[PDB]
Amino acid sequence: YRTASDGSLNWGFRQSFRNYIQTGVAKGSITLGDGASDNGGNFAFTPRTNGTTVTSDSQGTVEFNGSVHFLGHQAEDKWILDTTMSDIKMVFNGSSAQLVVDLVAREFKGTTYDDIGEYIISDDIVLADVSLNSAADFSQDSIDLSGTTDLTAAGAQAFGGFYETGEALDPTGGSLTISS
């Protein structure tokens, strides 16, 4: 039995999006919950107790504590951009990983304040593919989470279609310690 007992995934999705929300035309806010930390905009998520499943030295899943709530485009008393990301998971396959999230997000209806989307629940969405700097090996004492990230087709759609499929996101960072 091996489990991720310490460390953090450090990832703020995409700096241009955080800037878009906080200082750009969205004029909104970012709020972290459930244990996530800011860590300079490279949001830090801790591994969840019992959150590690290992199927092979190079394959497994680590579930993380934390959530991110994006708000933008305040129209009347509603926010037209209202996206919550939770249940963050990292699924490892050697030098590759996937970043999986649950999303609760208003549908994008167009670039007007004359219309607002209803909340769409998107569970278990693969948001990004990760190219890890080093191969994940759950038989070792640590896993380096550093790597580059590509947005998936479904992630692009979940974020209003403004990004193209395969677009680069923030690189992943951090590390986990694995023990018995």
Distance CA 73, CA 93 (A): 38
Among 4, 44, 71, 80, binds ligand HEM (CB under 6 A): 80
From the CB of 66, what's the least distance to ligand HEM, in Å?
A: 20
Q: Is 1 annotated in some ligand binding site?
A: no
Q: Which residue has the tokens 């905009």?
A: 41
**Binding flag, residue 162, ligand HEM (CB under 6 A):** yes
User: Angle 50-53-55 (CA atoms, 0-180°, nearest 5)?
Assistant: 160
Nearer to ligand HEM, 114 or 141 (CB): 114
Cα 94 to Cα 159: distance, rounded to the nearest angstrom: 28
Residue 94's H or E segment, with its range, is none
Q: How far is the CB of 69 from ligand HEM (least distance, A)?
A: 13
Is 16 a residue that touches ligand HEM (CB under 6 A)?
yes
Q: Which of 35, 51, 94, 160 binds ligand HEM (CB under 6 A)?
A: 160
